[PDB]
Each structure stands twice: as structure tokens, then as C-alpha cells.
Design a protein around this ligand. Structure first.
Ligand SMILES: [Zn+2]
Ligand SMILES: [Zn+2]
Length: 66
């Protein structure tokens, strides 16, 4: 009377990737649109005055980023 029940996947099987260099990361900076970027590319866009999102282009703000 002992056996798994919730799915059959062990350990976290998923990650993120930058929407620029496709750099696979664990904790990206999800903007206010959804897409994600890497520390680099991220710091680059934000330093563009009007950072949107290379992906679709919406808005990239460290404060609004996670
Ligand atoms: Zn990148
Ligand atoms: Zn986007």
C-alpha cells in the first residue's frame, strides 16, 4: 500500500531561456509581457531608454522584472 500518486516526474524538469541569445537560465527576468532574457541582453535593453522586449516589444523594467 505504498506508491507514488502525483505524476511520475522526479526533480524540476523545466527551465527558461533568453529571448535573444537563447541562453538557458533558471531564474530569468520575465518582463511585463511574458518573454524572458539573460542578465546581459536584459541590462542591454533596459539601457535603451525605452526598453520593450526584443521578443515582441512591450516594456522591460528591472522593478517590474522578476
Ligand atoms: Zn541573452
Ligand atoms: Zn515580449
Amino acid at each position: 500500500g505504498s506508491s507514488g500518486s502525483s505524476g511520475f516526474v522526479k526533480t524540476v524538469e523545466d527551465k527558461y531561456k533568453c529571448e535573444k541569445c537563447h541562453l538557458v537560465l533558471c531564474s530569468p527576468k520575465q518582463t511585463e509581457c511574458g518573454h524572458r532574457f539573460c542578465e546581459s541582453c536584459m541590462a542591454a535593453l533596459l539601457s535603451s531608454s525605452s526598453p520593450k522586449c526584443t521578443a515582441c516589444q512591450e516594456s522591460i523594467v528591472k522593478d517590474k522584472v522578476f
